[PDB]
Every structure is written in structure tokens, then in C-alpha cells.
RNA sequence: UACGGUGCUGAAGCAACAAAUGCCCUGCUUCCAGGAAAAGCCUCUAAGCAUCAGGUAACAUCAAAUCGUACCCCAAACCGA
RNA sequence: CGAAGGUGUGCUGUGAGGCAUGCUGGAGGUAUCAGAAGUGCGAAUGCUGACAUAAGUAACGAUAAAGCGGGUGAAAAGCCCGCUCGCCGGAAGACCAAGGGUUCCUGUCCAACGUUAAUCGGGGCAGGGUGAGUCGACCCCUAAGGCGAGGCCGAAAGGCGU
RNA sequence: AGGACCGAACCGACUAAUGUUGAAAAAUUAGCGGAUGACUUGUGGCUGGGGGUGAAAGGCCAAUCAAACCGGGAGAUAGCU
RNA sequence: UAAGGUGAUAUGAACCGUUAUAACCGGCGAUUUCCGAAUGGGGAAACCCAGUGUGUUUCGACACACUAUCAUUAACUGAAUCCAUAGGUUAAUGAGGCGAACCGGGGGAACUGAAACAUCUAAGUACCCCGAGGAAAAGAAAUCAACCGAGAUUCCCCCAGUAGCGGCGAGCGAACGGGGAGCAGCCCAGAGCCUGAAUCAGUGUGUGUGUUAGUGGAAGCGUCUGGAAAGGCGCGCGAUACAGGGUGACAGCCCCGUACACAAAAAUGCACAUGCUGUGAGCUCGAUGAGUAGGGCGGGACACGUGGUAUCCUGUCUGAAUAUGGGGGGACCAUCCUCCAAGGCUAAAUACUCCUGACUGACCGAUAGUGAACCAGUACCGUGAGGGAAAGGCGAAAAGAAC
């Protein structure tokens, strides 16, 4: 249920964003799902043998995984996955109305 | 048939530790940790050829282990061998040491 | 060899990434890792590919 | 013991002293042996009587045959 | 005193320990008792 | 000197007497209850060998593999929770 | 705009109980009517868990008792150093087998374990540590006894044994 | 010489005290009997439950014995509590 | 099949991958140390030791392969004795061990009940032991019925808790006949005519389906509350799908799916259709199951406890007819009717569940439900067989608390 490639400007449905667009992603089958859409707040002790401590938290992984509208040219949602012949066939890598890549 | 030997990795890494070096002002001979299986005559070969250090009788040894890691109940053995060659001082090595 | 590569000749010399291949490997065997400079790439590709080389030999051979 | 031609043996019956008992008994047979063939040579057999009989009735000889296919 | 049990791991495998159970008829069982039947992990030694 | 110990150097180093349940002693004496076995070892030949191989001795050389070896052990490491 | 469960209050019924509601709680709960039941415990020297009581009581394991000065440390009667003192010495010493299976040595740490304190330990976590042609086991040999080709027996299992 | 005598080790348990939620599910303390013998002990082996072993007490057969322990028939049966 | 990956506690590191060849899933294959039937001898399982070969050999020697017992056959040998057996060697074949229930066979308790207890009961049960299969077993009348007839075995309903058996106590307990599930019948006991067509066993292949990965698959907004919307309100759309689960609360339209339609290099279950091999078929004339049938004695099985007891079986002693002969028709006799024993084979309905997939439950929800939701048959306890626990929850997400 993978829905990004190398980049999927999405949008937030819900988790406290109303429609941030974002990049990374990651999603997939047996790991995560990151993207600008959220993020936190708190550093984690740094005893010293090297101050292993860079500095600095903010997201890292921030949760939210699936679930997430991906681009459209217009406004919001446009769930993808349709399925094309030829094309590649790795994957059906099509679009809903009228589109296939962005 | 060919005989089924390790021609080379019969052995493994040097052990080192505080017998180690310490060991090498003796007669130059140095310990490594061969495997199991080994058989002091297999390891003769060995060490002398491929790597160059015509040494000449040895010793070896076992060595076992026991610890326990998490919390409670998981526990083990482990294992292991010595060896410490020899190498007369006639025929050296270049030797591959430093501090 | 590689993948299909491997398949071409038939002499055993192809199968000796231990002699002299495998030296290296030797070196940096010391635990409490040591020898972390750049691209430490102490990582087993070449006895993973022992095999494949060890294997075709009966694909032609026998079996 | 299960007697070569005709095989029988320990089969189990009980006991009966008419008043009071079902105690289990056991049968047997007979055990004894002979036979010597006038094919070759004297073979012999641990038989039952009535197992001798039945060989000696028309076989003798003629019965040797399923011992061959044991 | 002396308690009833005593040490000797060369006198108890000669009683248990599968050449001293494979060796009698019901003594194959009871690995199979464990074994099949159960799940121990191992058991069969002094 | 780290306080545990370290490197160097280094005298005399014999006689007399006294003992054992240890050794000569798998002995000697004696007794009745009359006191394992098999291999190594020595030797004798069989079949076989039949200028050979083997045998004995001297020395020269190679080989002697593989496991165990830490510590407790009349006890705080074993049998008694 | 707070379900269940938990804790108070008021009203209500003949009663087993019902309702409303303040507080806690963080998700579900079920008028009515009909239906199926693991349907209601104080007792069974009842099962399981938790907590009392006695009570800060007895006891801290051989009556071979220990004193002092330093050191370390948050703290020393108990640990390290030192001088005394006492106890064992056919042993309370030393070595090995049996059994145990890292308890050995070094560094560390003191929660739990040490019948107290613990900087100390056979405790925790790390490392290190057992090197053989002559010692032992393998290995030749056989004892008691075991197993046992074929074999003799025996409903089967199996017993005996060259 | 001796199932001889006094007596340690070793083997055993006649007496008293203590212990009796013990140091201890049979011991400690002071005495006590045997101590070249039907002695005592290490290692391993052989006898299996109505069966073994027994210088005999129904004693011993793993803190269990007028019929061991474990699993089963089993939710035995219980006019009793 | 793919934009992501090198299982988990397990991150870190070093890497592998990305508009046609990482990783992952499925098929086939390769490798598969050692112990274990264990199989070269041995053996306190995971180890000790050996014989015959082999290559390399830096030519020292070492690593690997085979050498268990037993049976069928064959080949070679070869005693007491002329031969001849016995016995030895070899080779190929197969067997051995392990298993959940169900199945057949050998052996076979007591508690308990009878308010005691010996007949009897529990019960052919528990247990032990052998053996086989996806099923076993059974099975084509020497059956039953009554003078009409039915028609192998098997299982279900009923006859009936009846007839009957029984210290006629306890208790045991049918069948005839009737309704159903499901249905096939054939071989040898032997010689010709024809002659490889029926039909069986196993292989070959070809279609069609089943399975062992998969592909696609619909349709949401705005606003209010809120930390979070699926929730309240308003306006829409899909629907052969509104099963279910997930998603910071309760979502048909966000995610996975869902109906529905499609899919296989290969590997195979199974159908058919026929090739090959083995098999035999159809018909004329023949035969037509003896230590057996019966019987004495002793036991057992029949619902049936020897009874007035038929029928079946056999340890022991006997012993017939061969077809107008023989068996049965519940002591026995006559008559009548019925059926041919002493050879064998056979699918289905029937039994079970170690295990695989799908799907359900007025089934439990953490001293409940499996002993075990969790690194449980674990820790622990015992010499041993054997026994055998406890133990789930932060949160929406670690944002697990820099300082
Ligand atoms: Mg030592
Ligand atoms: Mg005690
Ligand atoms: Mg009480
Ligand atoms: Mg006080
Ligand atoms: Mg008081
Ligand atoms: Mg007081
Ligand atoms: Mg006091
Ligand atoms: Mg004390
Ligand atoms: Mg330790
Ligand atoms: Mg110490
Ligand atoms: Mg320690
Ligand atoms: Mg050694
Ligand atoms: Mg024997
Ligand atoms: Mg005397
Ligand atoms: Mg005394
Ligand atoms: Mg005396
Ligand atoms: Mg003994
Ligand atoms: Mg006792
Ligand atoms: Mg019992
Ligand atoms: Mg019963
Ligand atoms: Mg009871
Ligand atoms: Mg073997
Ligand atoms: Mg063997
Ligand atoms: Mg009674
Ligand atoms: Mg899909
Ligand atoms: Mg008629
Ligand atoms: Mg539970
Ligand atoms: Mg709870």
C-alpha cells in the first residue's frame, strides 16, 4: 500500500495540519511514514565521553503514516492507483480523473 | 580426493592481551586463536606457509565461557581455542608489530 | 564471478578469493572494532559469493 | 509351538470348577517331532499330532511345499 | 550424616541417558513419553 | 619500589650419632581358611618366505595425534533447602 | 456538553433493589419486551493472592573473646597496612580423587545477596586466566558383570546364551 | 598362635545433660563397646514389589514399607463428616 | 511483485536498491557438519577406533566414498559321506525407525454393582502387544423367510427395552419384518477356438478443472466542538461491494480490503482421451474346494449364565457323503421349502484428525480460556519415570523527561 515514489507533495486529512504539502515520505510494507507534516520537541541525554549531544530536536521520524492524500495539480485528495497497460506494468502508476505522474 | 582442509582459514584473528606481546619476548612465539578443530600440526602449516613465519611446535588450548547477558534466564557457553607457535629466532617474520 | 558471468570457463582458479583474495579480510578481524577511518567496508560480500562460484560446478558438472 | 503343517498353539480358555471360578487357563497343543523324507534325506519337524496325521494322511512329502513359501 | 544420594555422573548415565533407554523395550518410550509426547527441551542424563 | 614487590650480587654448604609404619620385601619364616585373569614381554615352531622379506644391535633422522589441566576439595565451590 | 468501573449524597420501593446526581475515570453502554444461563457465597481445618497478629518480641549458627595507630571513604568494630594478642597444628596445614563447573586473577560497582555496616566477598558487570611424546583419559589387556551373529526357548513383548 | 588382652585411627551406639519453632527432619558435650576380624572402607556390578534382601526387627529396598515411587483404570466406593 | 531493503529483542554501524533484473512471495534445483533406526567395530547420543579404495601430494601423509543385520533371487564356492545338502563369498532388490485419532488381530484387570459376597456385574473396558490404510473391516448365501417370497457387505431410523437370558436377583438384552444412505459384481480349482478389442496396473502425452505466488476493483466535502473527527449539522456520490480490520473518539465514499472479474515458468491432485508395457477378455467342452462335514471330552462366541438349546469357533481324541449328494429351517423325527461349506478378490454409504485453507459460534476474556495470550512444558522439584508454576495494559505517537 506503498503511495510515493522519490516525492509526494501530500496533504494532511487529519493530525493536527490542515493541508501541509511535504516531501520524503518513506511509506511502505515493514517501515515508516515521515513527511514535514508533523514534528516535535525534546533532546535526549548526552553523557560525555564525545559530547554526543549535536544539538537540536526537532522531528526526526515523526509518526503518520499512511492515510495521506498525495498531490494534484488543483486542490486536494485525487486518491491515485489506477493501473495502465504497458507502461512499465511494475506497477499500475496512473491517477484519478486526469493524470498519471506529477 | 582432495583433502577437505581449511588450507588457510583455519585459524582466525590473534587472541592479544596482557600474555600477549609479553609472550613474543619469549621466543617470539605468539598465541592467535585457531578453531575448534584445528590439530597443532594443521596449524604448524599454517602460520609458516602462505604467511611467511616458519615457526615449529606448539601448544593450544579450549576454553569455554558462560555468561548472562539480559535480566533473567538467558544464559550459554561459548567456547573457544588458543594456540601459541613459536618461531625460532633464527627464522624471524619482519615482524608485523608496533606499539 | 558475478551472476551469470560466472558461467564460462570451467577451472576452479575463479575460486580462490581465499588465497590472496581473502587476505584482507584478515587484517581487520579484530573485534573492538578498530580501523574505523572512512568507507570501512568490512562487510562479507566475498564469502557470500564463495558460494554461486562454489555452486555451477555441478550445474555443468552433474546436477 | 505352532506346529509346521496345521500351525496351532496357546490358545486361552478358562477354568470352570462348576461352583465358583472363571480362573483363565491356556491351551497348547502337542508338542513332539519327526519326520524323515524319502526324497533326500531324513528332515524332521517339531509337529502336533494331529498335524503329524493330515502329513501322513496324503502329504508327508506332499506338504513340504508350503514351507517352502513359509 | 549421609544424606540418600551421593555423587557418581559415571554410575547414572548407566541407568538414564538414551544407550541406557534405547537399549530396554519400554525404555525407548520414555523419550517419546517426553519427547513426542511433551516438548522438554532435553531430558536424559544424570 | 607502585609497597605487593623488584634488578644485581652472593659466604659456608662437611662430619658424627639417632630413627620409620617408607625401601630392600611380589622377599625370609610359618599357617590353614591354601590365596584373579588377559595382554604387553621372552621363547618355540606352523602355513608362508625361499640371493628377498624380516630378526637383533649401534647410531642419524622424522613421528608421538586428540581430549583434561583454572579454583574448591573433611569444605562457604561436593551430599545435607 | 464523559460510556463502564470506582466513591459520596438525596429520593424511592415491602424487599431483593431502582432512579437522579457531585467527585474520579477515559471509553463504550444498552429503555422495552422476549430469550439462554458457568445467575447471586461468611462459613466446606474451602482454593489463589494480598495484608494483619504476636512484635519491633525471639533470634543473628559452636564461649578459639580481641586492643590500638594509620589508609581509604559520604560513613570503618568488620575492608587494606602495621604492631600486639589469642586459636589450630595426625591439623582448623598441604596435595589429589569424587562431585561441582568459572567459584580462579585484575578492574570495577554495593540495588538485590551476605542473618548487621560494608569502601569488602564464593554478589553484579567487564575483561583476563588453565600451553604435555614422558601426569591422566583415549589406547592394548582382561575381572564382576553386560551385550550378543547364528542358535535354544517363549501367545506378542521378550528370556537365555556359542 | 588367638572371632586372645589394654588402647588411638577406623567402625559402632550402653548412659546422662542440652537441644525439641534445634547448629541438626536423630546431633552436640562428657563418659561407653569392638579395634587382625563373622573386621573396616573406595570403585563398579547383581537381586524389583506380593517381588527382592534379611545373624530375624516385619527390619531394609532413596527422610516412604503388614506390600516402594510414578502414571493410568479414576470423578474407585463413601447408608459417614 | 516491486520503492524501497540486510528476521526479532536492536539500535548503531557498514552496505544493497529505486520510470524493464535490491528485498519480499511462490515453483524446481544446489548445499545439507554431527548425534539419533544409525547401518564399518565401539560406545557413560552428539564422541573413541579401524579395514579397502581414491586424488592431490610441497609426494610426508592426510579429507572423502564404501564395509550393519535379515530376506528373495542369482553367481561363485563348498563338511561330516559318493554324490548331495549344510556352511562360506559376492551382487542387486526390499525391509528396520518415527509417528494424533480412527481400523483389524494376540493377551486382558480391579475398583465398582448385587446395598455383604463366590455365579453374574463393571467388560472384553483400562492397559500391554503385533499389523496395515486413507480408510480399515465386511462382502456376493451351504442367508432369511414360510409354502407368498425377499435377496452381498455396510451405516442411519424403527421393531423394543419387546422376545428372551438371569443367585429369573443385580442386571444383560436380540431378531423376523419395515423406512432410508449407498449400491458393481467377478475371478482360480482347466483344456481348446480365436486373438492383443473389453477391461485392470503402471508410465507417455493432450485438454479441462483444483491447488502451490498474484492483478485490478467503487465513491467526500463544508461547518461546529475537540488535543485529535469518523461525532453533531448541512449538501452530495458508489452500491452485485454496507464482511471485517486499521486510522490521535463512532467513517459505505482515508487505508487494507469487499462483490465481481482475471492469472502460471513451473510443480503437481484429479478427470477424461488414447500411445506404450505388463494383463488378460469372449465362447465349446470340463472340473466344481477332506483330516474337511459331523461326532466324544474341555473351553469360548452367540442377547441366551448347558438349559429342553439349536447355530459358530477350536485345545484334545476322532472322522462322511460326493449330487434323486450335502447344510439350514433353534433339542429331535417325518414332509416341505431354502441354500451349496471345506479357495480368493472387490469401490460407495461408515470412522477419525497430527496437519493446511476458508468461514462461523446467545464460547472464555489474564487466579477465565490451553499447563502455557508473555522466550512454557520454561523456571523450578525429584536419582529416576514423573511432576510443573508464576507472568498481559504508559501513550494517539515516545514527544521515555535537554536543563
Ligand atoms: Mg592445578
Ligand atoms: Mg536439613
Ligand atoms: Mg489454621
Ligand atoms: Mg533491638
Ligand atoms: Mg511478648
Ligand atoms: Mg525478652
Ligand atoms: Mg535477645
Ligand atoms: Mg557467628
Ligand atoms: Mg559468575
Ligand atoms: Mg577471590
Ligand atoms: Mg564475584
Ligand atoms: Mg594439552
Ligand atoms: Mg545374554
Ligand atoms: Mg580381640
Ligand atoms: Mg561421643
Ligand atoms: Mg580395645
Ligand atoms: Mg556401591
Ligand atoms: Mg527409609
Ligand atoms: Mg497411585
Ligand atoms: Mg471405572
Ligand atoms: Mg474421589
Ligand atoms: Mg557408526
Ligand atoms: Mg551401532
Ligand atoms: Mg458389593
Ligand atoms: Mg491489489
Ligand atoms: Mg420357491
Ligand atoms: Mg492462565
Ligand atoms: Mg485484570
Not at chain 1, 565521553?49 to 495539480?73: D, H, M, R, T, Y
Not at chain 2, 579450549?62 to 533473567?72: A, D, W
Request: glycine share 8%.
Amino acid at each position: 500500500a506503498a503511495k510515493i515514489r522519490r516525492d509526494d507533495e501530500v496533504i494532511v486529512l487529519t493530525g493536527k495540519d490542515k493541508g501541509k504539502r511535504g516531501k520524503v515520505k518513506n511509506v511502505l510494507s515493514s517501515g515508516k511514514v515521515i513527511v514535514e507534516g508533523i514534528n516535535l520537541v525534546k533532546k535526549h541525554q548526552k553523557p560525555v565521553p564525545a559530547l554526543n549531544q549535536p544539538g537540536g530536536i526537532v522531528e526526526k521520524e515523526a509518526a503518520i503514516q499512511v492515510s495521506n492524500v498525495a498531490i494534484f495539480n488543483a486542490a486536494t485528495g485525487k486518491a491515485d492507483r489506477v493501473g495502465f497497460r504497458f507502461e512499465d506494468g511494475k506497477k499500475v502508476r496512473f491517477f484519478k480523473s486526469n493524470s498519471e505522474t506529477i | 580426493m582432495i583433502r577437505e582442509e581449511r588450507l588457510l582459514k583455519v585459524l582466525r584473528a590473534p587472541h592479544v592481551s596482557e600474555k600477549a606481546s609479553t609472550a613474543m619476548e619469549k621466543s617470539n612465539t605468539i598465541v592467535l586463536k585457531v578453531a575448534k578443530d584445528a590439530t597443532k600440526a594443521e596449524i604448524k602449516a599454517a602460520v609458516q606457509k602462505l604467511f611467511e613465519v616458519e615457526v615449529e611446535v606448539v601448544n593450544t588450548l579450549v576454553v569455554k565461557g558462560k555468561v548472562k547477558r539480559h535480566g533473567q534466564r538467558i544464559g550459554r557457553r561459548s567456547d573457544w581455542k588458543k594456540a601459541y607457535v613459536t618461531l625460532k629466532e633464527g627464522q624471524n617474520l619482519d615482524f608485523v608489530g608496533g606499539a | 564471478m558475478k551472476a551469470k558471468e560466472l558461467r564460462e570457463k570451467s577451472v576452479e582458479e575463479l575460486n580462490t578469493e581465499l588465497l590472496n583474495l581473502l587476505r584482507e579480510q584478515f587484517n581487520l578481524r579484530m573485534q573492538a572494532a578498530s580501523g574505523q577511518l572512512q568507507q570501512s567496508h568490512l562487510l562479507k560480500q566475498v564469502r557470500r559469493d564463495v558460494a554461486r562460484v562454489k555452486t555451477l560446478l555441478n550445474e555443468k558438472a552433474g546436477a | 509351538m505352532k506346529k509346521d503343517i496345521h500351525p496351532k498353539y496357546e490358545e486361552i480358555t478358562a477354568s470352570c470348577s462348576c461352583g465358583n471360578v472363571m480362573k483363565i487357563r491356556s491351551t497348547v497343543g502337542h508338542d513332539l517331532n519327526l519326520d524323515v523324507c524319502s526324497k533326500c534325506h531324513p528332515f524332521f519337524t517339531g509337529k502336533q499330532r494331529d498335524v503329524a496325521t493330515g502329513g501322513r494322511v496324503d502329504r508327508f512329502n506332499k506338504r513340504f511345499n508350503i514351507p517352502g513359501s513359509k | 550424616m549421609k544424606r540418600t544420594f551421593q555423587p557418581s555422573v559415571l554410575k547414572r548415565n548407566r541407568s538414564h541417558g538414551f544407550r541406557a533407554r534405547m537399549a530396554t523395550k519400554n525404555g525407548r518410550q520414555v523419550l517419546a513419553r517426553r519427547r513426542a509426547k511433551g516438548r522438554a527441551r532435553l531430558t536424559v542424563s544424570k
